[PDB]
Amino acid sequence: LIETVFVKNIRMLSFEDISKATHLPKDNVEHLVMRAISLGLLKGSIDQVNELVTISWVQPRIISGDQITKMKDRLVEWNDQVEKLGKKMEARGQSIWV
Amino acid sequence: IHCLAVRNFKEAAKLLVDSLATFTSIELTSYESIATYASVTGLFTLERTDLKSKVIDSPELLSLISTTAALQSISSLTISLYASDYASYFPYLLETYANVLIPCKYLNRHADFFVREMRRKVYAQLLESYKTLSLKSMASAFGVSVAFLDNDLGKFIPNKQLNCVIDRVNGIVETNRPDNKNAQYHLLVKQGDGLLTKLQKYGAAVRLT
Amino acid sequence: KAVKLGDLKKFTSTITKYKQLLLKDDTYQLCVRLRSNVIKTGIRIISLTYKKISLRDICLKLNLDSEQTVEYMVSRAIRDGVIEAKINHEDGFIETTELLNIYDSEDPQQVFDERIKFANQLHDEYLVSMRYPEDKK
Amino acid sequence: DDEFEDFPIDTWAENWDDVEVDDDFTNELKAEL
Amino acid sequence: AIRDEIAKNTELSYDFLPLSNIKALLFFNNEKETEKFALERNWPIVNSKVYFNNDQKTNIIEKAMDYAISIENIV
Amino acid sequence: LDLMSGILHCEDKDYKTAFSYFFESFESYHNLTTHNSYEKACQVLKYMLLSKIMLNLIDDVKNILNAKYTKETYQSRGIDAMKAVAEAYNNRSLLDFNTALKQYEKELMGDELTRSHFNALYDTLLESNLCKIIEPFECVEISHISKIIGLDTQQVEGKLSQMILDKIFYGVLDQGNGWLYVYETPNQDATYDSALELVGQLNKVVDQLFEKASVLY
Amino acid sequence: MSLQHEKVTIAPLVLLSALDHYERTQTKENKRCVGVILGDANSSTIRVTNSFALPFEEDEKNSDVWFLDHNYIENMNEMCKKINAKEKLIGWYHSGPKLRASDLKINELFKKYTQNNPLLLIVDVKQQGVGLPTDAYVAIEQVKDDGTSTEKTFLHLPCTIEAEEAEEIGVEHLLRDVRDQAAGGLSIRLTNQLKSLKGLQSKLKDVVEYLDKVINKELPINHTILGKLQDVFNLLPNLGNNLQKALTVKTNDELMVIYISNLVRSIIAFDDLIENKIQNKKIQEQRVKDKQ
């Protein structure tokens, strides 16, 4: 369950996907996520009328070398956005920045 | 009395309802006409709680109901509205329009205004609780033809006075519930525009001087 | 009054009756253009009070002709801003949707921005006019 | 102070809506049945 | 011009409009020209059932900064 | 005099004054001891408990019942009946109140004031029970509500419309198949009302200020 | 053992004494300067109040050749106690510019003189920084981030410069030529906002640079840092849907309040204009009828 959440990503899920990826029947997935939430692996919330298991913060994992590049690029994009916003803010209100 | 005269009915309701107890100004009008005016305004403005404590249980009115045909008709209309007597509401409204509004002075000029809002009040009372009422059931309840009810109800919807949409294909009168935030925002925008225009005009007047 | 009721017959009668007075004010050219707005407001009235309305009834309440003309007018109207509705040709019914809550979008931002602009410029000219008696003081 | 002589004065040789009346609708035809 | 105006009107109003009614709605004469015109407007012709489908200022930031500037410049 | 002043006040549905009068009468009748003192004490006990009930305060009813001398000798089967009605009102169960009234009628139909008041008490209990069963629901069925309350569909529908019009619970009744959609209370944020009163006051201030400017003109 | 490292407060006198010390001993480049940080402690917020010079010496060589006088600490302690017994030794400071090798080693020398855990105070005495030139570093023992033996190392603490009544008076007098005492409220808050945004950008650029270094393996792999960065990414809210609607409705309400307040301000200006015009007319009439 944890590896499928971390690979497939998606803050939501489905009963069928968990059943196929864990070999348990579609009726025992609920108890599986019960154990997962109780033990602290996830902090999600179940939904049985439409099987749409919702996932939030997941237990952290040791980060490999490849993941550094993606995080670095995301940092670069975030920093560029921040710099552009700061430049616009400084340019627009230079009459009162004293 | 003056507030009732010029189409206000808001302050008039309060002051006439209060004045039923202390009315020593017989030089303006008799006590019966004051009771009639107070009942009319209280019916026309007050909410289903204020009616239960100001116009339908007031001992001053209770002791004087069986003294004048106009007071009897207005009290019957009020009790029909409060008791959900929707079957005979419209004939009672017509009787009150004939016997209480036209003969008087301060009310005959407002004969149309009072009648129009009474229909709106009864429609709002009927459509507040139900959410998918049928047009045939409504027409049977009010003792009118369905086409006439549709024609009458087609006037209070476009101005967003009532709260419903008429589904003529089926006859369903499905209710629409608005959010008071929207209406309050529109009212605030209009009032601010008016005040700002007034202030700009006055300022233009005073800066030249 | 004719526009508010959205009746083309009354509008035509009024236009024909007061044609000379309307042209003497040099506004008859503008006023004849109101004919489209009469149709627009009639469709607005018959679309705000009818969630699902048969096309024949739309034609009758609009004082108009066979279904094709009504369909053309409705199709023109919905893409012209007014009448956030939808037409389905199965059985002649214009299933108009609800109205989006205005207090959920950026329109109040624009309205309040205009109001703030007007108030701020008003206060600015107010101060600049007030300032002279300071020397005259 | 301007006389506005270019625009000649035209020669002639508590209220909102409620300009129509409902009259006596009655509709006793429903009461007939 | 009439036909393209009617096409613009129909692109937003009708959903799942049969092509047989389109042939008369657009004032055309024969189906082939109707299909060609629909292809020009890039409407799908699935089973003759056309499915139409289909700057001012930075919000918050610009307005708030401009209000602050207007308040403090005149001071 | 105190007892009958309370009796007349109870006809005005004001019970605090009625409760004070009844308590003074009960103390007066408890001090002395004649042949008819016991009957007067029992009747005034019934009247005070009746007056207390319509303003809730069930814990105080229990306190009065558990008062030592009141339950020592003045305790009687009629006070048992009235305390059963009290606890039925506490649980907000129309069935329990009806059972208590039917089983203990001999102590309650008498003292005409008690029955005339208990009619309105029954109406209030019906409204309260219809409020309680509806609380854990969003789309309850009218048939299930009628089964729980034991009433009829038409009477339940009428009572529900009456309470909805009076704004007791902010649900909306529907005629689909007997559904009773229940919606949370609206918000009506106070900021806009305050802003509107402010706008009116500033309008008046504008008129007064321009009037002050007449001397300038 | 006391856990008192949550907050650090420095009076400006300690820091200015640090600057005076550095400019006094004629310290050239690479020569650090060290003194003691006399203050009060045993509360959650460690507070530094007074300092003095120390005869710290060290050759730019093997880190263990550092020298420091032991008698001087107690000798200063006795005199300072005679002057004021409410100031107790709570550690030491060095004249920046950044943490060195011997900081952990020398800190243990002050263990006996201090009562709680000794406090390190880095002072950017030559002022390369942009933010506060002071940061605290309490030596604590925690497990290694690499899954190895537990290490007794330094921990950064949030340090805020705050003055008392005695020193605020002098600070306000000294810089009473550059501080903009008029400033304005909203303007100063907006300037603070822009400064905070620029600081965020600078820290982001520093983190990006460090990651660029680690991908080239000039630095080892710390799993704690990467985990904290991944947590930062996880906590990043997604706005560009329910949160968006809530924020929009709050912004609309807030703008309506702004509109009301601006209306009130305009009417106040209107009354001011009316009164001022009245007084001007009265003054004109006064001068006219008194001249004639």
UniProtKB/Swiss-Prot annotation, chain A:
It comes from the Eukaryota. Belongs to the proteasome subunit S11 family. Present with 12400 molecules/cell in log phase SD medium. Acts as a regulatory subunit of the 26S proteasome which is involved in the ATP-dependent degradation of ubiquitinated proteins. This is 26S proteasome regulatory subunit RPN9. The gene is RPN9.
Swiss-Prot record, chain C:
It comes from the Eukaryota. It comes from Saccharomyces cerevisiae (strain ATCC 204508 / S288c) (Baker's yeast). Acts as a regulatory subunit of the 26S proteasome which is involved in the ATP-dependent degradation of ubiquitinated proteins. N-acetylated by NAT1. The modification Phosphoserine is found at S105. Belongs to the proteasome subunit S3 family. Present with 16700 molecules/cell in log phase SD medium. The 26S proteasome is composed of a core protease, known as the 20S proteasome, capped at one or both ends by the 19S regulatory complex (RC). The RC is composed of at least 18 different subunits in two subcomplexes, the base and the lid, which form the portions proximal and distal to the 20S proteolytic core, respectively. This is 26S proteasome regulatory subunit RPN3. The chain holds residues 350 to 486 of 523 of the full protein. The lineage of its organism: Eukaryota, Fungi, Dikarya, Ascomycota, Saccharomycotina.
Curated annotation (Swiss-Prot), chain E:
The keyword rRNA-binding does not apply. Keywords: Proteasome. One of its GO terms (cellular component) is proteasome storage granule. GO terms for biological process: proteasome-mediated ubiquitin-dependent protein catabolic process; ubiquitin-dependent protein catabolic process. Disulfide bonds: none annotated. Belongs to the proteasome subunit S14 family. Present with 9890 molecules/cell in log phase SD medium. Acts as a regulatory subunit of the 26S proteasome which is involved in the ATP-dependent degradation of ubiquitinated proteins. Necessary for activation of the CDC28 kinase. This is 26S proteasome regulatory subunit RPN12. It comes from Saccharomyces cerevisiae (strain ATCC 204508 / S288c). The gene is RPN12. The chain holds residues 184 to 274 of 274 of the full protein.
From Swiss-Prot, chain F:
It comes from the Eukaryota. GO terms for cellular component: proteasome complex; proteasome regulatory particle, lid subcomplex; proteasome storage granule. This is 26S proteasome regulatory subunit RPN6. N-acetylated by NAT1. Component of the lid subcomplex of the 26S proteasome, a multiprotein complex involved in the ATP-dependent degradation of ubiquitinated proteins. In the complex, RPN6 is required for proteasome assembly. Component of the lid subcomplex of the 19S proteasome regulatory particle complex (also named PA700 complex). The 26S proteasome consists of a 20S proteasome core and two 19S regulatory subunits. It comes from Saccharomyces cerevisiae (strain ATCC 204508 / S288c) (Baker's yeast). Residues 18-187 form the PCI domain. Present with 16800 molecules/cell in log phase SD medium.
